Symmetry: D2
Subunit: 181 residues, 4 copies
């Protein structure tokens, strides 16, 4: 039984404990792939899909050629482009298909998933392993909320790293944002 604001603290504490189990060799590699790929696609189902979109948007703001798998105006992938798949289970059929198709086209696949031996993980060129396996990790939140929150924060850290690599600062960064609404 507790205050709404106290629940915010409990989440932040789950996030802090959980995020502090993510490995950095893989992450810094993801930034490097984003920097060298001509197009970047993000992907996810459900709420993870929302976090993908949030990451693609910020990538576009920074001037990258970023897209989201499954949207009306998604362009074709070409050889060497990157696909970033956020999936807790690593078993979502649609996402398994996206990874396979990417690979068939000689795209590069990065997967952020709990289980690296999952269907999606086994297709990936790069795996960023997220916490939450049967080994470890506490959460009082609904089914996949912690993973989804972790996805967002991790995406937004990759944004910071990209900013650093590009010598960009928050106060003065030019953003390519929509201007018709």
């Amino acid at each position: 039984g507790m205050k709404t604001t106290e629940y915010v603290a409990e989440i932040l504490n789950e996030l802090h404990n959980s995020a502090a189990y993510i490995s950095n060799e893989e992450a810094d590699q993801l930034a490097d792939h984003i920097l060298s790929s001509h197009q970047i696609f993000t992907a996810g189902a459900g709420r993870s899909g929302l976090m993908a979109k949030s990451f693609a948007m910020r990538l576009m703001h920074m001037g990258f050629n970023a897209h989201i798998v499954g949207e009306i105006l998604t362009p074709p992938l070409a050889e060497g482009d990157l696909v970033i798949i956020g999936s807790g289970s690593g078993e979502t059929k649609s996402l398994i298909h996206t990874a396979a198709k990417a690979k068939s086209l000689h795209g590069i696949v990065a997967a952020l998933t709990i289980n690296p031996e999952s269907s999606i993980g086994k297709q990936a060129d790069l795996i960023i392993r997220m916490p939450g396996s049967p080994k470890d990790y506490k959460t009082i939140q609904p089914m996949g909320s912690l993973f989804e929150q972790t996805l967002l924060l991790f995406y937004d850290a990759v944004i910071l790293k990209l900013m650093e690599k590009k010598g960009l600062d928050s106060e003065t960064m030019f953003t390519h944002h929509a201007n018709l609404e």
Copy 2:
């Protein structure tokens, strides 16, 4: 009282009678604006919005720099870009705003609307007048169905005209379609 297939014929007959009141000077101009603008944005609310998206998609397939107002990855408009607004009423507040903002940025606005003296029509550089004013036009369909259907067919005719101008044929046209699903 009638067969489902008979209702299809009645719709086609409303469409045929209705579409045969559209003026061609304005239309051919829209194609010409699409051909010369570096970016094209489409826009609409509700079902008209769906037709906008359907038109933007086909524009992208043909290699144009096409976007839809209000989507996650919509880029900024620049001077000289085109905004194509489909609105029956010409009074939707959000669309009035999009037109005004476009104009402030020195974009070009084309409006497909029933009432050229509407809020959206008065902002437009180009008006394609659609049938259905108090003067004319029969429809046994729900509120805005005929206008929405007419929008689709008109968009798809502009596609044909663009194909013609570009010396493209349906059987052999290269399309830039999504390839990850």
Copy 3:
């Protein structure tokens, strides 16, 4: 080569052919199913998907419990619910999945497609066959000057809007007070 208004005429010309081809017997079953199923789900990919959204919207307007497969707020399907899938080829991988999954849940699947023997057509309880088969082509019948599946998508829209009319007929529905009022 041709006025834009002349292309409209051509497009109309092609849709008239498509309408005469459609078997009303299957079409009429569709509306019956919409009227009896507690939930209705529409689906498609790309433009066909846009036409599925347009239909679901009008079903909602009529007071049906209508949904679109794949959206954030889509609820679970329960036994006896209807899923309506528009697919030209009947081979789109996501939609094969949706059809097979619906069937496994004992949903009723209605497929609108060119190929009744396609992967999606074979899962369907009801098939609404649209024109454009390699057969109707080589044998003189079907011709489109439009790209890709444009004629099919157009036919979908028009067919779905015709189904709305049949529904309104069957009911007493104007009473479109089910329209959004926010934003």
Copy 4:
């Protein structure tokens, strides 16, 4: 300059500041309103809009009649319904419209914003003030190394997920059988 995992730590550091700032009294009213209103509508633009969708999805999962302003299938708001608007600046033109329209329909409007005197904040029945005012800046309190409204959007997500917990507490809800099963 810093490891990606070090940036995660920094982001967390900023969210902790934002949580201590939030007045629980207003937060608690939000959940009360969610529990009493027959329909709940969420809204936002851009990323904030994504967080509004994430919240609406979880409300649906809990069996609430939840909707997202601006979607194809969004139903009309009726008197007494709740609209929850996330906006940093409280000046986004569409959202000003949504708030004023909701109020005119006698909906209840809850605004989550940095500026309670913003256009949206002035329409709100309930305001959940988030940090980041020019004041909290110049006076030492608020600092972000992240672009644009990233910290605010993150705070929104986390705040909405906290509200879910309070709702689950208040109820007996696991019983997330309200999850999509098609596709």
